[PDB]
Design a protein around this ligand. Structure first.
Ligand code: CU
Ligand code: CU
Ligand code: CU
Ligand code: CU
Ligand code: CU
Ligand code: CU
Length: 251
């Protein structure tokens, strides 16, 4: 599609992260209101998720079981809520410093951009010992995403670049995105196409696997967008942070 629609959220204040689950339910970190809201596909009535004590939340992710993970950036923690539960769990990360993006892979491993420590960390499901991902040279990184192959993508915000690391690899590759200006969110679809919110240029760009020529998505009227997500149908969701709204592009 070349024409976006505005999602029927209400009351958002500078939304940040966005995630979409297998059923098309959309999750948004309503950053300015210290809450996370969700909107089922076909719904015009949002629900506020029963997280407790959030402060300035940023990243959000959802796994195949519908567990929702939130970076509680103001409280230096990552919390999760299982589908149907009203009792959150704080993940046993160590030494987090102003974390930003969060992603979850098909094994349940949780990846967090530890923004103030210039690093990305991960916690296996049921593990209490995190590991650091062997990225080099990160500078105030923000978004993180992980594909079904285990490849991890990070927006190296301070360096105006996007970096990736294959599973088990110790050698990162810098993606051939061009013209970036303070990149923010990142997402990856089932085909390996990487989507990046080009925050300072009010646009969203993508790079197909195997390609080194990017495409700009036909969003319009964005102001300082932040989070991005893509569902299994190819629909792309962007938190239009500056306009307190979430927009989507079908196809
Ligand atoms: Cu703002
Ligand atoms: Cu804030
Ligand atoms: Cu902060
Ligand atoms: Cu910073
Ligand atoms: Cu910046
Ligand atoms: Cu800005």
């Amino acid at each position: 599609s070349n024409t976006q629609t505005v999602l029927p959220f209400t009351g958002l204040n500078t939304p940040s992260g966005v995630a979409v689950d297998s059923a098309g339910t959309v999750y948004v970190t309503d950053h300015g209101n210290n809450r996370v809201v969700k909107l089922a596909a076909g719904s015009n009535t949002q629900t506020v998720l029963p997280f407790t004590g959030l402060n300035t939340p940023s990243g959000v992710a959802v796994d195949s079981a519908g567990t929702v993970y939130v970076t509680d950036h103001g409280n230096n923690r990552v919390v999760k809520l299982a589908a149907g539960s009203n009792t959150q769990t704080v993940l046993p990360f160590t030494g987090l410093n102003t974390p930003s993006g969060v992603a979850v892979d098909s094994a349940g491993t949780v990846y967090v951009t530890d923004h103030g420590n210039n690093r990305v960390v991960k916690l296996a499901a049921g593990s209490n010992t995190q590991t650091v991902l062997p990225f080099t040279g990160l500078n105030t990184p923000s978004g993180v995403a992980v594909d079904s192959a285990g490849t991890v993508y990070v927006t190296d915000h301070g360096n105006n670049r996007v970096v990736k690391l294959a599973a088990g690899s110790n050698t990162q590759t810098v993606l051939p995105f061009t013209g970036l200006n303070t990149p923010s969110g990142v997402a990856v679809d089932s085909a390996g196409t990487v989507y990046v919110t080009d925050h300072g240029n009010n646009r969203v760009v993508k790079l197909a696997a195997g390609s080194n020529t990017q495409t700009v998505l036909p969003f319009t009227g964005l102001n300082t967008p932040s989070g991005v997500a893509v569902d299994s149908a190819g629909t792309v969701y962007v938190t239009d942070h500056g306009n307190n709204r979430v927009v989507k592009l079908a196809a």
